[PDB]
């Protein structure tokens, strides 16, 4: 359940999320686009969900992809900002889940973002310990799907 999953965000997981987000969230456009391109590269099967975006291979030059990527980074910002209060984090995660549920994105499909996060982190000198902290946060969202 979402409440049980939120409980897995221990003190050090919260800290590692904050420390890494201080860097990653610094360049929402570049890292947001990097994330999406990585997902599309590593999991081509997911492109079908993004038909509205047009030619995703254009990367930064695709205005729709750019607008989506930037926006995705503000949902992450939201989640980091709610870490202090589990009640607030859970209501924001359930709110975020509505549209994803409507699109038929299952927990397993959503979990495909972990690879792309790990790669983006690694590109900023954040290793496994950080990739695992983020996988925990992503697991809160999966619990809601």
Write out the binding residues for heme b: 100
Residue 29 makes CB contacts below 8 A (sequence gap 6+) with: 60, 66, 69, 70, 73
Q: 19 or 45, CB closer to ligand HEM?
A: 45
Q: How many CA atoms lie within 13 A of 134 on its CB side?
A: 23
> Is residue 75 a contact residue for a second copy (CB under 8 A)?
yes
> Is residue 92 a contact residue for a second copy (CB under 8 A)?
yes
> Is residue 110 a contact residue for ligand HEM (CB under 6 A)?
yes
CB 22 within 8 Å of CB 124:
no
CB 131 within 8 Å of CB 121:
yes
> Is residue 64 a contact residue for a second copy (CB under 8 A)?
yes
> Is residue 98 a contact residue for ligand HEM (CB under 6 A)?
yes
Three-class DSSP category at 56: helix
E strands in 19-76: none
**Nearest approach, Cβ of 140 to ligand HEM (angstroms)?**
11
Residues that bind a second copy (CB under 8 A): 28-29, 52, 63-64, 66-68, 70-71, 74-75, 77-78, 81-82, 87-88, 90-96, 98-99
């Amino acid at each position: 359940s979402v409440y049980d999953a939120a409980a897995q965000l221990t003190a050090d997981v919260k800290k590692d999320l904050r420390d890494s987000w201080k860097v990653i969230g610094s360049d929402k456009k570049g890292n947001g686009v990097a994330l999406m391109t990585t997902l599309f590269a590593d999991n081509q099967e997911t492109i079908g969900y993004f038909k509205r975006l047009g030619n995703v291979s254009q990367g930064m030059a695709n205005d729709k992809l750019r607008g989506h990527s930037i926006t995705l980074m503000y949902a992450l910002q939201n989640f980091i900002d709610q870490l202090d209060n589990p009640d607030d984090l859970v209501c924001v995660v359930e709110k975020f889940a509505v549209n994803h549920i409507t699109r038929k994105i299952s927990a397993a499909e959503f979990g495909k973002i972990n690879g792309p996060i790990k790669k983006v982190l690694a590109s900023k000198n954040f290793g496994d310990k950080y990739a695992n902290a983020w996988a925990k946060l992503v697991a809160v969202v999966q619990a809601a799907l």
